[PDB]
Design a protein around this motif. Structure first.
Motif, mmCIF file in Angstrom:
data_model
loop_
_atom_site.group_PDB
_atom_site.id
_atom_site.type_symbol
_atom_site.label_atom_id
_atom_site.label_comp_id
_atom_site.label_asym_id
_atom_site.label_seq_id
_atom_site.Cartn_x
_atom_site.Cartn_y
_atom_site.Cartn_z
ATOM 1 N N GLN A 1 -1.495 -2.132 -9.220
ATOM 2 C CA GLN A 1 -1.639 -2.100 -10.671
ATOM 3 C C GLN A 1 -2.540 -0.958 -11.121
ATOM 4 N N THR A 2 -3.560 -0.564 -10.327
ATOM 5 C CA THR A 2 -4.334 0.657 -10.650
ATOM 6 C C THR A 2 -3.433 1.885 -10.636
ATOM 7 N N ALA A 3 -2.640 2.058 -9.569
ATOM 8 C CA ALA A 3 -1.741 3.209 -9.500
ATOM 9 C C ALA A 3 -0.792 3.243 -10.694
ATOM 10 N N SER B 1 -5.887 -7.826 -2.938
ATOM 11 C CA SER B 1 -6.485 -6.522 -3.194
ATOM 12 C C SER B 1 -5.439 -5.416 -3.180
ATOM 13 N N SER C 1 -3.880 -5.389 -6.611
ATOM 14 C CA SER C 1 -4.795 -4.766 -7.561
ATOM 15 C C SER C 1 -4.739 -3.251 -7.464
ATOM 16 N N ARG C 2 -4.702 -2.723 -6.240
ATOM 17 C CA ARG C 2 -4.572 -1.280 -6.072
ATOM 18 C C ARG C 2 -3.250 -0.775 -6.638
ATOM 19 N N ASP D 1 0.817 -1.212 0.000
ATOM 20 C CA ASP D 1 0.000 0.000 0.000
ATOM 21 C C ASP D 1 0.856 1.269 0.000
ATOM 22 N N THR E 1 1.314 7.070 -6.758
ATOM 23 C CA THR E 1 0.281 8.045 -7.086
ATOM 24 C C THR E 1 0.700 9.459 -6.699
ATOM 25 N N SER F 1 2.024 1.862 -3.525
ATOM 26 C CA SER F 1 0.935 2.416 -4.336
ATOM 27 C C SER F 1 0.726 3.897 -4.040
ATOM 28 N N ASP G 1 -1.312 1.888 -13.690
ATOM 29 C CA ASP G 1 -2.106 2.205 -14.875
ATOM 30 C C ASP G 1 -2.322 3.704 -15.055
ATOM 31 N N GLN G 2 -2.291 4.482 -13.965
ATOM 32 C CA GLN G 2 -2.503 5.923 -14.013
ATOM 33 C C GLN G 2 -1.252 6.715 -14.360
#
Ligand SMILES: [Mn+2]
Ligand SMILES: [Mn+2]
Ligand SMILES: [Mn+2]
Ligand SMILES: [Mn+2]
Length: 317
Positions: free
Chosen positions: A310-312, A304, A307-308, A40, A47, A43, A314-315
């Motif tokens: 990989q979201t960060a 989870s 997944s968070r 976390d 970001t 991530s 992706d941005q």
């Protein structure tokens, strides 16, 4: 340009161990609170800082024998079991944290996030070596260890900042030479190096370094204010002509051997033989081995969090 993020791994996963409740567990019942918190934090950093390069710096030897040979008390109160030459001592670490370090390192390797280490050196040295060598991007060293404030730099470019985790990542701000000078009263023009000289004289209880007896932080700051550097202070003590007080001379001259030994202990190495686990320090934008990452994350109960992450990623632009 975007900064390169240099992460003090052990500083961060110790913080997550004490910052995330131990009822967060894997399906086999082992706590994974440090794993979750560490992923976390990556991530959150991705970001906030949007780096293209990121390195997790490892402690290949958390307590190097070459430092211990100079000052035997160095980190001595944190050793669970001392080991003979060539073998890192066993650090006193909670029994349910050590397996989580192994879990984190497995996930980083499977994802392909760069990690860096140097045999016989601390992550502190890896950090100092990579920040000293950086020529392209501003450096952000991420750590709760005040030892790393000695790395702050404005010139030569690029700058180096410490994103200091003493109050946690959410409250963390970037420290440069100005912040170190303002908070510790060291000269701005050499704040990082002066901070290490201040720490040398005043001592470092978490690392077991006593400092020079009778020289507290306030006296050390005023001596650096007047003389500018530790070498100048020693010169002022060795020259009976200087305006150094007789009491300060006695304290400094009484510690010449300790001060010489401590200089190399307190200063982070800037030319350690760092090796990367990856070809470059580029932050991957997706897992290098996604099947293995999903299996590990499932087994370690942090699917989870991954997944968070990989979201960060992706941005990122
Ligand atoms: Mn040993
Ligand atoms: Mn360290
Ligand atoms: Mn220290
Ligand atoms: Mn340290």
């Amino acid at each position: 340009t975007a900064p390169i993020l240099l992460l003090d791994g052990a500083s961060m996963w110790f913080r997550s161990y004490f910052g995330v409740p131990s009822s967060i567990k894997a399906p086999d019942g082992r706590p994974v609170n440090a794993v979750r918190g560490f992923i976390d934090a990556i991530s959150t950093l991705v970001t906030r800082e949007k780096p293209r390069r990121l390195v997790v710096c490892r402690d290949d030897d958390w307590r190097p024998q070459w430092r211990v040979d100079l000052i035997p008390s160095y980190k001595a109160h944190r050793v669970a079991e001392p080991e003979p030459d060539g073998v890192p001592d066993i650090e006193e670490v909670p029994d349910d944290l050590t397996p989580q370090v192994n879990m984190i390192l497995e996930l980083l390797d499977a994802f392909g996030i760069p990690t860096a280490g140097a045999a016989g050196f601390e992550a502190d040295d890896v950090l100092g070596t990579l920040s000293a060598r950086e020529e392209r991007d501003p450096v952000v060293v991420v750590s709760g260890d005040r030892d790393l404030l000695q790395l702050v730099r404005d010139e030569p470019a690029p700058q180096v900042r410490v994103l200091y985790l003493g109050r946690g990542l959410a409250k963390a701000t970037k420290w440069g030479p100005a912040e170190v000078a303002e908070q510790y009263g060291v000269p701005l023009d050499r704040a990082g190096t002066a901070y290490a000289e201040l720490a040398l004289l005043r001592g470092d209880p978490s690392d077991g370094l006593p400092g020079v007896a009778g020289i507290g932080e306030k006296t050390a700051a005023s001596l650096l204010a007047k003389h500018g550097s530790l070498q100048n202070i020693l010169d002022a003590a060795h020259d009976p002509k200087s305006g150094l007080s007789k009491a300060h001379r006695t304290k400094l001259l009484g510690a010449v051997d300790y001060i010489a030994a401590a200089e190399t202990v307190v200063r982070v190495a800037t030319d350690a033989p760092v090796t990367f686990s990856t070809p470059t320090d580029t932050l991957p934008l997706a897992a290098g081995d996604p099947a293995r990452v999903a299996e590990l994350a499932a087994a370690y109960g942090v699917s989870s969090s991954i997944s968070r992450l990989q979201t960060a990623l992706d941005q990122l632009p």
